[PDB]
């Protein structure tokens, strides 16, 4: 019943648009409604996740001032009971760091809408 709240972190507004487009108000009709919180700066994302109340965080590994993998590592080291983290990786060879970030899932750029949706479903289920 609660609208799942998803944090979308990316300096690039187009990556946020793509994430918010692959995912919709409902990932599937069986899932609850989805609410998106866009954040463009790592401090703001950290503050938001400090307030809690998030079911998933999508962090762009290509974020300019503070990459998504660093933010994922930070949040998993700083927020207790933090939501599962999905990281967007700018290249295949970033996969290793995606593992190091301990993000529950990694989706390479360019963001395949279906792959992102499937990963999000797997993390929420």
């Amino acid at each position: 019943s609660a609208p799942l709240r998803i944090l979308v972190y990316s300096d690039n507004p187009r990556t946020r648009e793509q994430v918010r487009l692959a995912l919709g108000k409902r990932i599937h009709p069986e899932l609850p409604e989805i609410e998106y919180v866009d954040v463009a700066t790592a401090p703001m994302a950290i503050s938001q996740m400090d307030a809690g109340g998030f079911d998933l965080a999508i962090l762009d590994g290509e974020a300019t001032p503070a990459g998504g993998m660093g933010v994922a590592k930070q949040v998993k080291d700083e927020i207790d009971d933090c939501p599962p983290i999905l990281v967007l990786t700018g290249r295949a060879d970033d996969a290793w760091l995606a593992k190091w970030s301990r993000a529950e899932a990694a989706v390479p750029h360019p963001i395949d809408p279906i792959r992102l949706s499937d990963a999000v479903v797997s993390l929420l289920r």
Binding site: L21, A22, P110, D112, S117
Partner: protein, 782 residues
């Protein structure tokens, strides 16, 4: 048995076929002889004198590009002969004295044969302290091709191509001596459909593409092998893109398909995906307005609409889709929608055409090849215009005519420039009388000759009984019959099903064994058995309101025989799902729209008219997804696993199914119904789509459109006199739907027949007149 002669190049012996040129033998042996005017596909000319080599027993150096091998010849190139090296370097020097100091600004820079061969076979510094020859630069010889005569090395490759390969000698070597220069006559532009090849054939930056001008250098281009998506020739190509935008598409090198040639369409008609009309996100209809929607929302809405449509759904696949995409459409329709209403014919067509394709085309791949057109003693063109449709077929036919003396016969209303360039003979037939001529040609000994060929165009479908007549003619004479469509994906669609009466691999729908075989291959209980509706039947049903929903993939309603009926059908259909690349008429009336990747962004494969597979990997890595994946995940949302997550999966499934291999369906055997009779002020309409026309994929390329042939209504002299018209004066051809006005051209056609460009700008015969070829249209002056 081919005769092998043997000779020594430098000091290494080699055996090559008799008649081989020394330059070719050196190539096979790995010796790099500098060359400018030589071209493997052009008749040697020996102009530039760059390829000189020393041959024992000859006082003068011999141009290796003009010297035929001899059984005991001794050849020593610049690598093993000071005389040959000195000659080649002197020629290079003389070649560079007049050349402009333009390398930084020359488009050919970095990819210039002159630069590379001057480095490898030239002196390090100039001795030319004198004044260089100069010309105004760059002058335009056409809307697409710029000419910088100062850089020209007068290798004549452009002219030799425009004369030999393409029969379009609108450029030639003008003037004399140092003033000699390639040029058009006065203002008559270089009008060849293959003009772009002259840009790719020039060994210097003399001829350049105006579109590619100053766009990039070789180093920053991402270059990928590709297959042209425009027509059925399936030319190999090289797509070069910079910063994610395609800048040019070179001819590639496929000796079995197109050798090293393109038509201007394939070379330059790549901007369609970037004209600003592209659909970037899934769209949904709400409150009568089409607005962006998330992939999840769009998929859910589409699935709900299709499920509520039950089995009352039609699937218009169009001809643009790759083989994998067409297979996805067929599988989706016959598994998810449980309907046989799949039809790729987004054009004039008939049930006879479906029967003919099932009987004689589907599953029968590689029956005829380009290499055989090049050798066929006789080629009979029925409802097919090689230049306007599948230009590389025209190139191969011209090659055969020039080399092997192929005889070309065309059952067409008039001699198109393409047919004239093939030296073909017309059998003047008013459209609709093609069956009569085809039946009457049973006794033509020319077809009886071994290897004779019949090429049937898609347009021949519009003539009732014409395909049956062609099949009868092929059976009687034994000439191999080959069907050549316009669009690239049509043959792939046939092999992938996509017809109401065909399953994948040419498996007939009306066959319990084939149906069970495919069902087992798909891990499904059973396939629909009800006969499928064709495109015309689907549109008629939808217009009447008896169709619940439509799945339209890449279809231009204007291309349909009755576009008014098509728009009425899509509008009256309660639910319409569009898998579309660009905003279109269907999109303007669809309830759900799914953006699908263009060819340059998607993996896949086409099937040329030969049935040859033409695979290609994506050039632009992008989040855009093919029709195949959109259908797969739409089915997944609907709850059925299409098992087609990627083009590789579709290819593997098609390979697993294989061809039918059982009882081939019967021949169409349709009757030759009587043709309509045109009364006073009326004429039977003939038409075929011009290569450069108002085709959607040709959008975004104004230069290519400018290169398009001038639209003109073509009439017999008697017919023009009857309506009181004069050659060059405007003429109007009209039906209840509307009228088309074009300048008149007297063309020595059969009397009572009027020809129009089917979709040239200002013609749009289907859109305006609402009738296909063979219909009766009122004619008038002014």
């Amino acid at each position: 048995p081919v005769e092998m002669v043997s000779l020594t190049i430098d000091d290494h012996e080699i055996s090559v076929p008799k008649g081989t040129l020394l330059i070719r033998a050196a190539e096979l042996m790995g010796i790099q002889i500098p060359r400018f005017c030589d071209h493997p596909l052009l008749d040697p000319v020996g102009a530039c004198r760059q390829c000189l080599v020393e041959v024992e027993g000859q006082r003068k150096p011999m141009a290796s590009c003009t010297t035929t091998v001899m059984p005991d010849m001794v050849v020593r190139t610049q690598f093993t002969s000071e005389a040959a090296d000195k000659a080649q370097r002197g020629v290079m020097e003389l070649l560079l004295i007049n050349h402009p100091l333009d390398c930084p600004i020359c488009d050919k820079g970095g990819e210039c044969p002159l630069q590379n061969q001057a480095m490898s076979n030239g002196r390090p510094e100039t001795r030319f302290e004198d004044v260089k020859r100069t010309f105004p630069k760059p002058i335009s010889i056409s809307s697409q091709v710029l000419l910088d005569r100062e850089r020209c090395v007068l290798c004549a490759r452009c002219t030799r191509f425009s004369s030999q390969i393409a029969g379009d000698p609108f450029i030639d070597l003008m003037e004399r001596g140092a003033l000699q220069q390639v040029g058009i006559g006065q203002d008559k532009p270089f009008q060849s459909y293959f003009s772009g090849n002259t840009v790719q054939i020039c060994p210097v930056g003399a001829l350049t593409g105006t579109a590619y001008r100053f766009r990039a250098r070789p180093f920053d281009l991402v270059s990928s092998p590709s297959v042209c998506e425009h027509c059925a020739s399936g030319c190999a190509q090289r797509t070069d893109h910079r910063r994610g935008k395609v800048l040019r598409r070179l001819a590639g090198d496929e000796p079995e398909v197109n050798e090293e040639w393109n038509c201007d369409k394939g070379r330059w008609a790549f901007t369609y995906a970037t004209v600003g009309d592209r659909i970037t996100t899934p769209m949904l209809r709400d409150g009568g307005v089409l607005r962006p929607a998330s992939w999840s929302e769009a998929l859910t809405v589409a699935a709900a609409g299709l499920l509520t449509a039950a089995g009352s759904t039609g699937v218009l696949v169009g001809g643009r889709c790759t083989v994998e995409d067409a297979y996805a459409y067929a599988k989706f329709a016959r598994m998810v929608l449980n309907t046989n209403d799949v039809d790729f014919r987004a054009r004039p067509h008939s049930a006879e055409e479906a029967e003919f394709l099932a009987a004689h085309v589907a599953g029968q791949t590689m029956g005829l090849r380009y290499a055989e057109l090049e050798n066929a003693p006789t080629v009979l063109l029925a409802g097919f215009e090689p230049e306007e449709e599948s230009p590389i077929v025209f190139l191969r036919l011209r090659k055969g005519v020039r080399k092997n003396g192929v005889q070309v016969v065309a059952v067409a209303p008039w001699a198109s420039r393409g047919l004239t360039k093939l030296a073909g003979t017309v059998v003047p037939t008013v459209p609709g009388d093609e069956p009569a001529a085809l039946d009457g040609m049973h006794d033509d000994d020319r077809l009886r000759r071994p290897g004779a060929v019949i090429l049937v165009g898609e347009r021949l479908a519009t003539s009732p009984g014409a395909l049956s007549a062609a099949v009868r003619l092929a059976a009687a004479t034994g000439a191999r019959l080959a069907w050549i469509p316009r669009r690239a994906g049509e043959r792939g669609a046939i092999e992938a099903g996509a017809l109401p009466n065909l399953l994948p691999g040419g498996r007939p729908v009306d066959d319990a064994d084939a149906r069970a075989e495919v069902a087992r291959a798909w891990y499904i209980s059973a396939l629909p058995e009800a006969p499928g509706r064709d495109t015309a039947a689907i549109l008629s049903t939808a217009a009447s309101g008896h169709l619940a929903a439509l799945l339209v993939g890449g279809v231009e309603l204007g291309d349909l025989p009755d576009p008014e009926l098509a728009v009425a059908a899509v509008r009256t259909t309660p639910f319409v799902v569009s898998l579309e690349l660009r905003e279109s008429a269907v999109t303007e009336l669809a309830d759900v729209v799914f953006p699908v990747a263009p060819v340059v962004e998607k993996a896949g494969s086409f099937l040329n008219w030969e049935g040859r597979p033409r695979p290609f990997a994506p050039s632009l890595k992008t989040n855009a997804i093919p029709d195949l994946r959109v259908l797969h995940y739409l089915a997944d949302e609907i709850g059925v696993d299409l098992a087609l997550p990627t083009a590789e999966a579709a290819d593997a499934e098609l390979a697993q199914l294989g061809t039918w291999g059982g009882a081939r369906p019967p021949a169409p055997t349709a009757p030759p119904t009587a043709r309509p009779e045109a009364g006073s002020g009326q004429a039977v309409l003939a038409s075929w789509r011009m290569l450069l026309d108002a085709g959607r994929l040709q959008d975004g390329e104004p230069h290519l459109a400018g290169t398009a042939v001038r639209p003109v209504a073509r009439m017999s002299a008697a017919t023009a006199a009857g309506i009181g018209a004069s050659d060059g004066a405007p003429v109007t051809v009209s039906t209840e739907r509307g009228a088309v006005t074009l300048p008149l051209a007297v063309t020595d056609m059969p009397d009572g027949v009027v020809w129009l460009p089917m979709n040239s700008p200002g013609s749009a015969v289907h859109q305006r007149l609402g009738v296909t070829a063979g219909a009766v249209v009122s004619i008038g002056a002014g």
